[PDB]
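Deviations from the work plan: none for this task. Representative record:
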Amino acid sequence: FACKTANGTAIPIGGGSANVYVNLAPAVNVGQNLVVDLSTQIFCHNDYPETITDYVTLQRGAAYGGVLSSFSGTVKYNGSSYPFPTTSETPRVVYNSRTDKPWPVALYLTPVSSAGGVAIKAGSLIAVLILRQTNNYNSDDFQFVWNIYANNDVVVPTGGCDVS
Amino acid sequence: EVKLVESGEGLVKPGGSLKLSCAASGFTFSSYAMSWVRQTPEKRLDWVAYISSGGDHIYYADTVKGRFTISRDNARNTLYLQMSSLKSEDTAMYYCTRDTGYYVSRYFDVWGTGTTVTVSSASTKGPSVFPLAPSSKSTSGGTAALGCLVKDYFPEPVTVSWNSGALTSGVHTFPAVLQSSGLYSLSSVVTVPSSSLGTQTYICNVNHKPSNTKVDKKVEPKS
Amino acid sequence: DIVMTQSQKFMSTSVGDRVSVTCKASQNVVTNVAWYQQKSGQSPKVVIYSASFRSSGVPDRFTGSGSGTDFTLTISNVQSEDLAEYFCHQYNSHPLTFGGGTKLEIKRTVAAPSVFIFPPSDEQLKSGTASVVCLLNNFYPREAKVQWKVDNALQSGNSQESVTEQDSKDSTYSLSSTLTLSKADYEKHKVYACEVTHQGLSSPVTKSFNRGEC
């Protein structure tokens, strides 16, 4: 069960924690989406599909930085939707391909601020996902930890739109 | 104002190396990353290299990785693209731009002057310039055109100015390109009434700095 | 990679019109596509970053949109100097790759080419070469067909054409054609025809000089 980040980072078979650098829009108004769409940055695949067929879940989520200052949103995984970090465990998706396969995850965002300036701390850690992997042949239980790194400081629109 | 000064051009035989030098002006360098992008002349742009504002994060595209290294000094305020292991033409218009790299999102906001990179087999060579001997018969009292062909030079910077700059009637610009493997050629055009075809003549000046050729070719009608 | 495919041609637009420029992604680029304006052999300028917000120094006649796989740039009103190459770019998946660029063309009246021929090459005849120069100046439109004949025989590879960009005063194009012949080969035939097929010419009309006349 190998994997690779679109930036060239790769976690070998067995587990580990890796860093991904994702880009974000320079300006988000009142709740557009501020999505990450990690389905173009992480690609895991299976080793021996003849007998070993992998099953990939999102074990847990966590948020850090300016998201935990004033933000909210949802998370997508294979035609579903959950709130900010999943308090429950989402179901499994079968990885059974000896080929590249985008991981269908995202992170929707929306500002709960009323009057603020800078947001999403640049170069900081936006979120952490924990790819849990099981199989149909062994009790293999590891954690591909992925750490979302902010690439830019997202600026909330300035003051205005007020009445007496 | 912000400017990105550029220097360090030169023709390179395959298997060589050049150090492209780029400096900045008008801001605080330590807070902005830089990138190198090649604009192939009026052709396909290609992103060459990225370097962080500090110098710890360094990535290259598949076409340049394994052949390029980059560096920068925050205090010295001068980039350095040290590139080697030349292959596959690579003939582009290399250009240092301030991309708002990691800790900001990629923009390639401001660009400077840029430098040219050529990878061929021959060496530096000087042009030969030949004017366009105009015919007074074809004018019929109307208008006639001529110019100054500048053949066989390498590499390819041009100027276009004619005699003493006192020829506002006529030449402004003409960027011709090349031939297969002989050498390069361009020209320009003056198109004026036939009084000059009656009794007048000019000269044309053309420069080429790497060969250091400054030609003032004078025109005489051919009888 | 993620090919940021875009129309491999220019888009016709007269002054006072609206310009729409396409740009297509094969793979899912999330968002944040950049748009630059590059003139004839000059520095591209940041115009529309992230395909939705304007840059400083860029007029309000600029904007654009797009998401998913399809992006578009738009000019509300086309002034005289705005017309140039226009570049789309993605930076949400390494390796970050640019688009093909889009050329802005004015639509104006047909101007048939002023066509001329000159064999004025005797100074370099000691070197053993003659460079006949055919010259078409300030024509409309850009595309032109140049054919060369050596004693009524069609030629290929011994001659070439070179054109310029669009101006800003008259907005025309100029073309030159070079026929390079070795002196032994140059001084064996007489008619060296420069035929031109064009939209401005109802029928092609060729012009040649003969070896021994001025």
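The first strand of chain B starts at residue 3 and ends at 7.
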